[PDB]
Amino acid sequence: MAMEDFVRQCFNPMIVELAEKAMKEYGEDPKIETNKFAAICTHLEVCFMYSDFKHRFEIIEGRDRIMAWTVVNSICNTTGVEKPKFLPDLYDYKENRFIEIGVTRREVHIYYLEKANKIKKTHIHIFSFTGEEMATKADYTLDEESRARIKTRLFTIRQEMASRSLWDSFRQSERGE
Ligand SMILES: O=C1c2c(O)c(=O)ccn2N([C@@H]2c3ccccc3SCc3c2ccc(F)c3F)[C@@H]2COCCN12
Ligand SMILES: [Mn+2]
Ligand SMILES: [Mn+2]
């Protein structure tokens, strides 16, 4: 069972199509980087579930680069929040801060450090496939139920992969050698 076939079966087609466009834009082939194809789908789903819990969250992820920065610029212009160097994933209109969503197959503490290091005001929220999470100042933003649902979906994706013998590959491809 190919990872590419898993992605197209396990994820909603709107998620798959946006993941494909994002990979084309950054010059990556979903037929070759199939684990990355799956990771982008998973992360994209988490961002939509995050902004699902008028609307508290603007979704930056899932847009072509130009539109993504247009939304970021428009928000900064109307709130005076400092424009970030790196594209974030969400904007929280209640806390008035951008959010960076991370999903990792490794230890959350390790991935949190990697993310915090790369961006040096953007709130960070890391999820794992084991039910763990780590967030800036231990401020998890959402209520308990909302995070429990994200954790359950991630764990379900993991078990759906494991049943098709895809988990081990997916786990090891996150960080290079
Ligand atoms: O939006 C993201 C992004 C994140 O937000 C993230 O948390 C991790 C990684 N990201 N990257 C995603 C991405 C997203 C989710 C899971 C893995 C990857 S792996 C690199 C890659 C991404 C998108 C397309 C592509 F072809 C890639 F090679 C790029 C980093 O440059 C800003 C846009 N972006
Ligand atoms: Mn992003
Ligand atoms: Mn992210």
* Domains with residue ranges and CATH for the chain: 1-177 (3.40.91.90)
Say whether 45 counts as a known binding-site residue. no
Query: Solving technique for this entry?
Result: X-ray
Say whether 110 counts as a known binding-site residue. no
Beta sheet of 57-59, edge-to-edge order:
57-59, 90-92, 97-104, 123-128, 133-135
Say whether 60 counts as a known binding-site residue. no
CA of 80 to the centre of ligand 3 (A): 23
Displacement of CA 164 from its chain's centroid (Å): 23
d(CA 39, CA 43): 6
Only one residue has tokens 């503490």, namely 109
Residue 101: which of 85, 68, 125, 130 has the closest Cα? Answer: 125
Which listed ligand is nearest to 29 at the C-alpha? 1
| E runs forming strands in the chain | 57-59, 90-92, 97-104, 123-128, 133-135
Expressed in percent and rounded to 5, the helix, strand and coil fractions of the chain are 55, 15, 35
Could you tell me if 71 and 63 are in contact, meaning their C-beta atoms sit under 8 angstroms apart?
A: yes
CB burial class (10 A; 0-12, 13-18, 19+) of residue 1?
exposed
CB burial class (10 A; 0-12, 13-18, 19+) of residue 63?
middle
CA of 61 to the centre of ligand 2 (A): 5
Catalytic option among 115, 120, 121, 151 = 115
3-state secondary structure of 121: coil
Kindly provide the resolution of this structure in angstroms, with one decimal. Answer: 2.3
Active site residue 21: no
Displacement of CA 148 from its chain's centroid (Å): 16
Pocket of ligand 1 (CB under 6 A): 22-23, 26, 28, 36, 39-40, 43, 61, 87, 89, 101-102
CB burial class (10 A; 0-12, 13-18, 19+) of residue 67?
exposed
For CA atoms 84, 110, 130, 9, give the dihedral sign: positive
